[PDB]
Amino acid sequence: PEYQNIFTAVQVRAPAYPGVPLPKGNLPRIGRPIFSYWLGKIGDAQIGPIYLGLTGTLSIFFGLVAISIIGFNMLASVHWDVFQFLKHFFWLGLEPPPPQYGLRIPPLSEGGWWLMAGLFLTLSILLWWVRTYKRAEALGMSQHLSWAFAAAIFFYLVLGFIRPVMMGSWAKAVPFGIFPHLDWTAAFSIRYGNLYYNPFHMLSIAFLYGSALLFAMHGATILSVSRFGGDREIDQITHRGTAAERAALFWRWTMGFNVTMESIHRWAWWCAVLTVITAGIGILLSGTVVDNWYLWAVKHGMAPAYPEVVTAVNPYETA
Amino acid sequence: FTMNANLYKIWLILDPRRVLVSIVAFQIVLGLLIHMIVLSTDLNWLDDNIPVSYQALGKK
Amino acid sequence: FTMNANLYKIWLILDPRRVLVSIVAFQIVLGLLIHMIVLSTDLNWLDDNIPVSYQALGKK
Amino acid sequence: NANLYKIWLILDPRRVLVSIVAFQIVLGLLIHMIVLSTDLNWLDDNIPVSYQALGKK
Amino acid sequence: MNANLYKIWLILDPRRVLVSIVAFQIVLGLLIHMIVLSTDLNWLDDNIPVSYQALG
Amino acid sequence: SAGITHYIDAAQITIWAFWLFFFGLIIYLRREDKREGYPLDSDRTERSGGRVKVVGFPDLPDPKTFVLPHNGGTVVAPRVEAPVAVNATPFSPAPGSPLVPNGDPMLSGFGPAASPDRPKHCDLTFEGLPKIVPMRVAKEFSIAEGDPDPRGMTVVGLDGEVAGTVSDVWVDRSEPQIRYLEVEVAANKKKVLLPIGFSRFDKKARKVKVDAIKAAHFANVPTLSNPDQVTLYEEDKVCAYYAGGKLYATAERAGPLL
Amino acid sequence: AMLSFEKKYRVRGGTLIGGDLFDFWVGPFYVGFFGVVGFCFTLLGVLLIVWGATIGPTGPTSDLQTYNLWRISIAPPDLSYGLRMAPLTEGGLWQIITICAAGAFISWALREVEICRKLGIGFHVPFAFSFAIGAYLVLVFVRPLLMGAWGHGFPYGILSHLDWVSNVGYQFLHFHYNPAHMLAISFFFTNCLALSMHGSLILSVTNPQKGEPVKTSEHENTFFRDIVGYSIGALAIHRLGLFLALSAAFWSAVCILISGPFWTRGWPEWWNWWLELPLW
Amino acid sequence: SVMLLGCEGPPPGTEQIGYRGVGMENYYNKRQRALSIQANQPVESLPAADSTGPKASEVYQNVQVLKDLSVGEFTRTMVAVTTWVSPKEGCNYCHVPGNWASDDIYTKVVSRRMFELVRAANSDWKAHVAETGVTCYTCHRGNPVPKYAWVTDPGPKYPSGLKPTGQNYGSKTVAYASLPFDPLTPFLDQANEIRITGNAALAGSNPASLKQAEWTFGLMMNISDSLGVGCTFCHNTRAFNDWTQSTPKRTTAWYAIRHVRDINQNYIWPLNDVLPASRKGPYGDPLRVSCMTCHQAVNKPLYGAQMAKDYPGLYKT
Numbered sequence A: 001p002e003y004q005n006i007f008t009a010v011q012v013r014a015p016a017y018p019g020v021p022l023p024k025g026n027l028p029r030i031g032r033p034i035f036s037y038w039l040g041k042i043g044d045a046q047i048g049p050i051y052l053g054l055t056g057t058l059s060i061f062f063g064l065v066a067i068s069i070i071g072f073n074m075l076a077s078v079h080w081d082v083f084q085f086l087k088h089f090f091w092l093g094l095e096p097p098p099p100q101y102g103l104r105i106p107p108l109s110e111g112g113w114w115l116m117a118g119l120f121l122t123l124s125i126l127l128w129w130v131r132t133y134k135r136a137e138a139l140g141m142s143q144h145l146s147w148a149f150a151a152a153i154f155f156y157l158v159l160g161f162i163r164p165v166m167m168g169s170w171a172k173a174v175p176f177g178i179f180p181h182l183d184w185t186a187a188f189s190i191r192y193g194n195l196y197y198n199p200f201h202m203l204s205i206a207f208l209y210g211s212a213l214l215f216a217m218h219g220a221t222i223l224s225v226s227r228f229g230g231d232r233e234i235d236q237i238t239h240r241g242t243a244a245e246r247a248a249l250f251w252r253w254t255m256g257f258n259v260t261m262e263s264i265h266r267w268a269w270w271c272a273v274l275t276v277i278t279a280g281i282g283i284l285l286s287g288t289v290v291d292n293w294y295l296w297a298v299k300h301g302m303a304p305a306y307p308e309v310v311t312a313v314n315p316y317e318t319a
Numbered sequence B, C: 001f002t003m004n005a006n007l008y009k010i011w012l013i014l015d016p017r018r019v020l021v022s023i024v025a026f027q028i029v030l031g032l033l034i035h036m037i038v039l040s041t042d043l044n045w046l047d048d049n050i051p052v053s054y055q056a057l058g059k060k
Numbered sequence D: 001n002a003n004l005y006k007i008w009l010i011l012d013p014r015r016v017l018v019s020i021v022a023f024q025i026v027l028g029l030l031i032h033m034i035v036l037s038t039d040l041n042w043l044d045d046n047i048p049v050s051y052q053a054l055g056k057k
Numbered sequence E: 001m002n003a004n005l006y007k008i009w010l011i012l013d014p015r016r017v018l019v020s021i022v023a024f025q026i027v028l029g030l031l032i033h034m035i036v037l038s039t040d041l042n043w044l045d046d047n048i049p050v051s052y053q054a055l056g
Numbered sequence F: 001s002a003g004i005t006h007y008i009d010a011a012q013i014t015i016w017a018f019w020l021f022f023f024g025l026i027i028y029l030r031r032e033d034k035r036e037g038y039p040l041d042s043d044r045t046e047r048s049g050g051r052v053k054v055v056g057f058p059d060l061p062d063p064k065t066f067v068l069p070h071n072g073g074t075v076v077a078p079r080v081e082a083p084v085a086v087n088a089t090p091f092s093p094a095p096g097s098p099l100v101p102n103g104d105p106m107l108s109g110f111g112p113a114a115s116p117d118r119p120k121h122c123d124l125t126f127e128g129l130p131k132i133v134p135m136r137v138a139k140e141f142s143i144a145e146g147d148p149d150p151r152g153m154t155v156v157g158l159d160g161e162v163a164g165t166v167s168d169v170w171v172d173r174s175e176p177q178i179r180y181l182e183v184e185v186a187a188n189k190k191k192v193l194l195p196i197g198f199s200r201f202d203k204k205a206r207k208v209k210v211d212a213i214k215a216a217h218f219a220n221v222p223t224l225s226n227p228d229q230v231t232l233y234e235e236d237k238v239c240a241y242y243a244g245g246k247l248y249a250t251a252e253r254a255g256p257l258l
Numbered sequence G: 001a002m003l004s005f006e007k008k009y010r011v012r013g014g015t016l017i018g019g020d021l022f023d024f025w026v027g028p029f030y031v032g033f034f035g036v037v038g039f040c041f042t043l044l045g046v047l048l049i050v051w052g053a054t055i056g057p058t059g060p061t062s063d064l065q066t067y068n069l070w071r072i073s074i075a076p077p078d079l080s081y082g083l084r085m086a087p088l089t090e091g092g093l094w095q096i097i098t099i100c101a102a103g104a105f106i107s108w109a110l111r112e113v114e115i116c117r118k119l120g121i122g123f124h125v126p127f128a129f130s131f132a133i134g135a136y137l138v139l140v141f142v143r144p145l146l147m148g149a150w151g152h153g154f155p156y157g158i159l160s161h162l163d164w165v166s167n168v169g170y171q172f173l174h175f176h177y178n179p180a181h182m183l184a185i186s187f188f189f190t191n192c193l194a195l196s197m198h199g200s201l202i203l204s205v206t207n208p209q210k211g212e213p214v215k216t217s218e219h220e221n222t223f224f225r226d227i228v229g230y231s232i233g234a235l236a237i238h239r240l241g242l243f244l245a246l247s248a249a250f251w252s253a254v255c256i257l258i259s260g261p262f263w264t265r266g267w268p269e270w271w272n273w274w275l276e277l278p279l280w
Numbered sequence H: 001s002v003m004l005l006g007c008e009g010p011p012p013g014t015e016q017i018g019y020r021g022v023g024m025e026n027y028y029n030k031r032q033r034a035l036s037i038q039a040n041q042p043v044e045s046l047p048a049a050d051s052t053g054p055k056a057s058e059v060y061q062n063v064q065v066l067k068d069l070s071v072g073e074f075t076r077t078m079v080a081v082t083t084w085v086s087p088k089e090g091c092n093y094c095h096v097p098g099n100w101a102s103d104d105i106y107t108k109v110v111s112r113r114m115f116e117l118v119r120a121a122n123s124d125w126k127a128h129v130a131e132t133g134v135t136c137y138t139c140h141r142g143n144p145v146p147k148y149a150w151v152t153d154p155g156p157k158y159p160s161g162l163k164p165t166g167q168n169y170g171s172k173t174v175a176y177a178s179l180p181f182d183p184l185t186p187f188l189d190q191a192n193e194i195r196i197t198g199n200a201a202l203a204g205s206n207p208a209s210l211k212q213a214e215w216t217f218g219l220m221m222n223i224s225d226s227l228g229v230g231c232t233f234c235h236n237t238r239a240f241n242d243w244t245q246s247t248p249k250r251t252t253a254w255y256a257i258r259h260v261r262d263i264n265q266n267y268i269w270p271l272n273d274v275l276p277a278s279r280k281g282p283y284g285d286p287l288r289v290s291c292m293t294c295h296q297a298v299n300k301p302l303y304g305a306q307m308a309k310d311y312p313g314l315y316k317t
């Protein structure tokens, strides 16, 4: 019956803290920070202000462009009739260029807007990684986001520049819509064996799990010992305490081994990065490498073998 | 106004500002919804009939 | 309002603001929801039938 | 029930009382349901209640 | 065994084994109805008098 | 893959790659995992696992140098630590047996209410002033417009019966979040910091029940050296107490139910 | 053995349903009333399964029967024996294992609790673990029941259990459109993003630039207050986390409890109630 | 745009297509499997045949399809070929007031062909149609025009001369999903290759555009929907191509996807001339034949009931 740190019960407030000032080059921060009791009944109720440098704008701009394309072309589809646009929303989208112009600039119509819009969600995305490392260390901060961001941004390119363009196919590159995009993953699994057989996916999974696992534990753990300032990890990292005392101990008399209020945060950043890493891996192999991972698998002695209560015939042979 | 007579006490329990800005939207939305819904199937005066066939007669 | 005589007490346990504005949303949804159900199925009085198609006869 | 009044100094008033109230409702919803599945599907299955199979058709 | 068992409650509290077993009986109580209603005689939907479910 | 060697191609090479560098990085972590708390203490048991190495397979890493904030000493890791006391007696000499909290456990400072001796220097904010302070100096603050102000709420023992009340709710200059509530106890007529983390709000009756320690225990609550600010050392100190209550405040709690 | 500072927390008792007996440690693990049992199932599984590895498909002789994790897998009984103990060889064994594994996660789960008690901490951990526990039941129990078949669950194959999904998944064609699977997926993603941020940030403040001080929240709470504009807060992250994950799970849990016993058409269709709205 | 929990109460259907615990399974809502049967019911055949009499090519001015039939039997046919077809309009539907040898009615012209359709089928593709064969009741189920035809879908509106993509939309055509929304015309009508699995593990073989298998899907969707059974039914998922792994059903579908090729590219297609507009499509076409047209979301139209068996004039001689 103890206040289980769910939603900050009683809150409090103080003026808008525009963060630690920045050196000679970091333009002025911008915004008149706001407060939201609700949002704040979970976290730092203050809102903003936010920075906006060159890449900051430069990137944001290159952002709300593809959107203004992948967004436009899409609406066009349902002949500028929003009503249905609203209906066939989750279905709509913008497809890539036809297998002909494999790499050539597709016409203003046939998959053109997609290559256009694409490149603008190729830069802005890559430019925003800059809007990190930049605003990152200019805080006296090292780089670990910027890092991961790549690992992720890596996989994104393994779904474009690096592979789709690597197989000469302005098609082999994912569409641009929830469902259709939801289909690309579907389509892919097929066109090439069946991904469940490409290790680097069955791998990249365990990770997307671990993260779904760990940052899910340490999120609790912290909480469990959040009374003992566990949440204050920062210092716990430096000057330990009963927090990291009670915590790690848990896992010690649980799964045996254990670690530190520091270490964990490591595996964290790792499993995560070691996810999109393995992602873009398979996705890169699958295409210009093995064509059917199911065959691959068994051909390596991997793929299992069950009895056979059902089998069919083969027209191409008897006929 | 069988009840609208003593109904005045209504301002007292209901926030003037909360109720005023609320109908402001419900009406603003209900109406855009109704013209959206009716115009969809019933009578789509837009792409439905007359006066002339700007598209049909003009395009061709 | 016979209940009233014995029904006044309800309001000491039920906050006026909590139940007043609350039912206001209930009436608003169910309603919108019903036309949605009836209309959509039973009889779609709107696009369903009579007096007769207007956009269809004037279009062709 | 003559000497079963004493059980009350042990079992708390609040916990069991509404603890079972719920026990019922879940068993109540559960039972109607378990049976309906196969056994007797009084609902959509026969007459006079047969206004769907006969009517709709 | 029960002859000298009276002593049991000296080491255990009343609510301790009092409701735990009840919970154990309800869990086993229905855990069994199901498993039996499964093979020996699915009485619920097994044979007759189906008159009302069938002829009905 | 389990038998030995079968197929042979390219991609299957790489699967070996990552699934190698993994078993490398895995160790990296292992080491980085060991920084603090290492090496182990007693021989109550040996290292469970495949290869029972001296002390952990990954040779303990080297010292790490933590450059603390302005006006702050420097911390490193690993960093040998001075053995502590064990105010308790082993229920059994058997390796792995528990240690009973000699005398009054509530303060015997053990397990359920034990703690380390963090630096005795109030952790400060960005520039200088100390982060966690009472709403006294925290005058530039204001209760969340809406949330019922806790100043004046009468605390209530887990036994139910009152146990003093409140005073200043120690906010913070870093994050507008309440972290502590001053509790002018009833018998001591003193001030005992209340760890919100342990304080359950009951905005309905102005109360603030804490199912952690009986009303009386608010007297044995480690007293604050200074009321205008609290140091890391004590930041852990006040907390750890109530903590014990979780397994002390009643003979019931600690002992098994069935 | 004990940690540098563990030696001072190993109080006596704190157990749940009894356990003041085996209330001790071994290596760095606390036993109690649950570390004990879980073990049982463990070998009467980790090894009981070995029997399976031994037996295999046809028999322990069939060229089909192998010893390669990649292939080894214990198959559930045929839908035939609905909610009944199947012949180990034909199904039961599978059930048996599963029988155990259930408790092995129910024990270790509880054991976690006793611990959570000893170390006088919060219990967010187990409570969390439970979801994860549950999602394993509502995916080999809650479902198969509303399918009248135990053998109607899934296998225990190193990768073999993969297909089991492949099928049951296609059983609705584009499983992808399942409303849940969408969200539940989304979470298992968002989680793997925030995580790839917190665990990052921290490891970027406590070990910041060269010749720099162990930064303070006075940075963190601005790090994103700059890039993205707003910062959920520090305490928060360790909330959003459990949230995401402890939801993602419970979601997916729904995701496959309804797929079948609550919906038979291809999911893509479910998405029709949308279209057919008397509006567009 | 909101999260949901199944809208069907349990327990459902339970077909174990595959080995104990492997995957391929099948689930169906009884409460539907019911109606769908109680509704997809066959109309009892006509009373016994005459067996007596000469023929019909004899007595009748012009009777090419049913020439060998005895008058009586032959007449059964007309009756049947009425109730199965337009028992609302009577005989006159395929005939002229009086003069019955007239071929002045496009209905008849084709009716004629429809005969060369059924039989030809019932006898030569028994590998798909088997012993249940087909009747007029099938596609026409008490209706002159089969509610289950399919003119090449134009697609959704065109944005100022600009909407080439034919994937993103969502159209029942495909159990509902952003797909070609018309895999039929380029498949069921024409005959575009359907395989896409790479024959060999490594590359250097199947150069098929993913987009290509992207279409097979849709098709496959429709198919799977038409009959109303998950891809498990004919497939072993992991093995969408390994026949040795598929199920009997598959092959039994193979042909079908050609008997239709036939039926469309050979019968319903040509007869477009005699067919008015009201049966022609926008891109100018004849409502051909989908697997749905007969199947109507079932595995053996009217679940295996074999009407055609009770009609001798419905088999190539």
Ligand code: BCL
Residues within 6 Å of the ligand: B010, B014, B019, B034, C020, C023, C024, C025, C026, C027, C028, C029, C030, C031, C032, C035, C038, C039, C045
């Ligand atoms: C279905 C076949 C019929 C039909 C049959 C019916 C039937 C039958 C009924 C309706 C009803 C309604 N129909 Mg109709 N309706 C049809 C076609 C239409 C069409 C159309 C375009 O074709 C439209 C736009 C409508 C629209 C409407 C709404 C005006 C109306 C009420 C909704 C409601 O639940 O209140 C929501 C409620 C609330 C917000 C609050 C509760 C009300 C209280 C008593 C007052 C508030 C007190 C408050 C505390 C004081 C403060 C005051 C202000 C709020 C500040 N109908 C067709 C032709 N329709 C219902 C109706 O009009 O009842 C009068 C009804 O019973």
Ligand code: BCL
Residues within 6 Å of the ligand: D021, D022, D024, D025, D026, D027, D028, D029, D032, D035, D042
């Ligand atoms: C299955 C074949 C039969 C059938 C056979 C049975 C049988 C046999 C039984 C029921 C019973 C019930 N059936 Mg039936 N039922 C059928 C078809 C239906 C249909 C339908 C649409 O077709 C409906 C809507 C129902 C609905 C119902 C419920 C009214 C009822 C109680 C369930 C429960 O769990 O209470 C849970 C209980 C509680 C929450 C409260 C506990 C009660 C106490 C004693 C009073 C409360 C005291 C309190 C402090 C004072 C305030 C009162 C309120 C709590 C506020 N049946 C078919 C035709 N049905 C049961 C029943 O009603 O018995 C009387 C029962 O035994």
Ligand code: BCL
Residues within 6 Å of the ligand: D007, D011, D016, D020, D031, E018, E019, E021, E022, E023, E025, E026, E028, E029, E030, E033, E036, E037, E043
């Ligand atoms: C399977 C073949 C038969 C059949 C054979 C049997 C047999 C044989 C038995 C039952 C029994 C039961 N069957 Mg039957 N039953 C059939 C079909 C049915 C159907 C059905 C829809 O078809 C139903 C709904 C039931 C339902 C029931 C239950 C009423 C009953 C007890 C269950 C239980 O374990 O509670 C669980 C237990 C408890 C809650 C605790 C024990 C009670 C104590 C004494 C009081 C508590 C005291 C405590 C200190 C204070 C109260 C606190 C509370 C714990 C909170 N049967 C078929 C026809 N059934 C059992 C029975 O009714 O015995 C009387 C039994 O022995």
Ligand code: BCL
Residues within 6 Å of the ligand: A185, G101, G105, G131, G132, G133, G135, G136, G138, G139, G164, G165, G166, G167, G168, G169, G170, G174, G175, G176, G181, G184, G185, G188, G248, G249, G251, G252, G253, G254, G255, G256, G257
């Ligand atoms: C057929 C192929 C379909 C498909 C079919 C299915 C099916 C079928 C299912 C899922 C399920 C899920 N899918 Mg899917 N899915 C597809 C594509 C995807 C994609 C994708 C990017 O393409 C994603 C991200 C997902 C994501 C998801 C998750 C939301 C969800 C739950 C997984 C889980 O963690 O259970 C969490 C599970 C557990 C916590 C239990 C295991 C842990 C236990 C308690 C402890 C083990 C201890 C051990 C035995 C002891 C030894 C010690 C060792 C060291 C471990 N799917 C394709 C389209 N998907 C599943 C689901 O919804 O489950 C609810 C499910 O059943």
Ligand SMILES: CC[C@H]1c2cc3[nH]c4c(c3C)C(=O)[C@H](C(=O)OC)c4c3nc(cc4[nH]c(cc(n2)[C@@H]1C)c(C(C)=O)c4C)[C@@H](C)[C@@H]3CCC(=O)OC/C=C(\C)CCC[C@H](C)CCC[C@H](C)CCCC(C)C
Residues within 6 Å of the ligand: A059, A060, A061, A062, A063, A064, A067, A124, A125, A126, A128, A129, A132, A145, A146, A147, A148, A149, A150, A151, A152, A272, A273, A275, A276, G189, G190, G192, G193, G196, G197, G227, G228
């Ligand atoms: C394992 C690695 C995981 C990961 C890591 C990861 N993601 C990251 C990072 C990292 C390390 C970042 O550093 C970066 C980030 O958040 O930096 C602050 C990011 C990020 N991950 C993101 C998304 C994302 N990550 C995903 C996944 C993952 N990222 C992996 C799980 C996913 C998926 C598919 O699950 C998504 C969707 C972004 C929030 C962010 C990168 C943002 C970026 O590059 O933005 C560029 C700029 C724009 C898009 C312009 C926006 C335009 C306007 C500001 C908005 C206006 C409204 C809008 C157009 C709506 C339409 C309205 C119209 C009517 C106008």
Ligand SMILES: CC[C@H]1c2cc3[nH]c4c(c3C)C(=O)[C@H](C(=O)OC)c4c3nc(cc4[nH]c(cc(n2)[C@@H]1C)c(C(C)=O)c4C)[C@@H](C)[C@@H]3CCC(=O)OC/C=C(\C)CCC[C@H](C)CCC[C@H](C)CCCC(C)C
Residues within 6 Å of the ligand: A209, A210, A212, A213, A216, A217, A251, A254, A255, G038, G041, G042, G043, G044, G045, G046, G097, G098, G100, G101, G104, G105, G108, G109, G112, G125, G126, G128, G129, G130, G131, G132, G155, G156, G157, G158, G159, G161, G245, G246, G247, G248, G249
């Ligand atoms: C959203 C919740 C996430 C989560 C959370 C989570 N997991 C947890 C916890 C938490 C909070 C713990 O506290 C607990 C832990 O590590 O405690 C120290 C744990 C744990 N999560 C684990 C695994 C695990 N979690 C997974 C996922 C998740 N866990 C989710 C992503 C997954 C997968 C596949 O995604 C796995 C494999 C364990 C390492 C550990 C629990 C260990 C435990 O209780 O083990 C008991 C039993 C044994 C050691 C012996 C096994 C003997 C059995 C008889 C055999 C069982 C056979 C099995 C069913 C077949 C497996 C074969 C498959 C390949 C088909």
Ligand SMILES: CC(C)=CCC/C(C)=C/CC/C(C)=C/CC/C(C)=C/CC/C(C)=C/CC/C(C)=C/CC/C(C)=C/CC/C(C)=C/CC1=C(C)C(=O)c2ccccc2C1=O
Residues within 6 Å of the ligand: A210, A214, A217, A218, A219, A221, A222, A243, A244, A247, A248, A249, A251, A255, A256, A257, A258, A259, A260, A261, A264, A267, G042, G043, G046
């Ligand atoms: C032929 C042949 C060899 C046959 C085999 C025959 C055999 C061996 C038979 C025996 C079978 C048996 C009995 C096996 C069981 C043996 C046992 C007991 C194994 C241990 C079981 C077990 C659960 C091991 C752990 C499993 C693992 C590694 C899971 C990985 C998940 C993962 C990444 C966990 C992270 C672990 C860490 C680092 C935890 C520490 C940790 C965490 C998580 C915090 O959150 C935290 C917060 C604040 C401060 C500190 C910490 C902290 O230290």
Ligand SMILES: COC(C)(C)C/C=C/C(C)=C/C=C/C(C)=C/C=C/C(C)=C/C=C/C=C(C)/C=C/C=C(C)/C=C/C=C(C)/C=C/CC(C)(C)OC
Residues within 6 Å of the ligand: B027, B028, B029, B030, B031, B032, B033, B034, B035, B036, B037, B039
């Ligand atoms: C010295 O002076 C000082 C400075 C002190 C003060 C100065 C004051 C000044 C300068 C004031 C200036 C005021 C000005 C410039 C005011 C300008 C006002 C304007 C331009 C008003 C315009 C109003 C328009 C309105 C209210 C439009 C309303 C539209 C409505 C309600 C539309 C409803 C639409 C629906 C429901 C649509 C549905 C759409 C479909 C049918 C498509 O849905 C299907």
Ligand SMILES: COC(C)(C)C/C=C/C(C)=C/C=C/C(C)=C/C=C/C(C)=C/C=C\C=C(C)\C=C\C=C(C)\C=C\C=C(C)\C=C\CC(C)(C)OC
Residues within 6 Å of the ligand: A067, A068, A070, A071, A072, A073, A075, A076, A115, A118, A119, A120, A121, A122, A156, A157, A159, A160, A161, A173, A174, A175, A176, A177, A178, A181
């Ligand atoms: C009309 O619109 C209005 C005005 C109403 C505004 C509304 C807009 C809206 C609602 C927009 C909505 C957009 C949505 C929902 C988009 C969804 C997108 C999704 C789900 C995308 C999913 C995946 C996308 C991927 C994987 C994209 C990959 C893109 C790549 C890899 C692009 C690569 C580009 C390269 C490499 C370019 C290289 C340059 C050249 C081509 C020259 O090199 C040869």
Ligand code: HEM
Residues within 6 Å of the ligand: H059, H060, H061, H062, H063, H064, H065, H066, H067, H078, H079, H081, H082, H085, H086, H090, H091, H092, H093, H094, H095, H100, H101, H102, H108, H111, H112
């Ligand atoms: C029950 C009312 C009907 C009667 C009494 C009837 C009668 C006849 C007769 C007497 C002939 C042979 C005439 C000749 O060419 O010499 C004939 C032929 C034919 N009837 Fe009908 N008929 C009926 C309904 C229909 C219907 C509804 C169809 C439409 C599908 C139809 C299609 C045909 C065809 C296609 C032939 C030519 C036979 C062949 O080529 O094998 N009849 N009918």
Ligand code: HEM
Residues within 6 Å of the ligand: A190, G173, H193, H194, H195, H196, H197, H198, H213, H216, H217, H220, H221, H222, H223, H224, H225, H227, H229, H230, H231, H233, H234, H235, H240, H241, H249, H250, H251, H253, H254, H257
């Ligand atoms: C909706 C789920 C389905 C999907 C995703 C699907 C997918 C596929 C794919 C990708 C192929 C080509 C494999 C290759 O050769 O490379 C294929 C072939 C085939 N499928 Fe399906 N299928 C589905 C349902 C069905 C159903 C229900 C049947 C059975 C009636 C069926 C019968 C066939 C047959 C006979 C072939 C090979 C002949 C051909 O069409 O060229 N499929 N399917």
Ligand SMILES: [Ca+2]
Residues within 6 Å of the ligand: A095, A175, A180, A183, H167, H168, H214
């Ligand atoms: Ca597409």
Ligand SMILES: [Fe+3]
Residues within 6 Å of the ligand: A218, A222, A233, A265, G198, G199, G202, G238
């Ligand atoms: Fe953390």
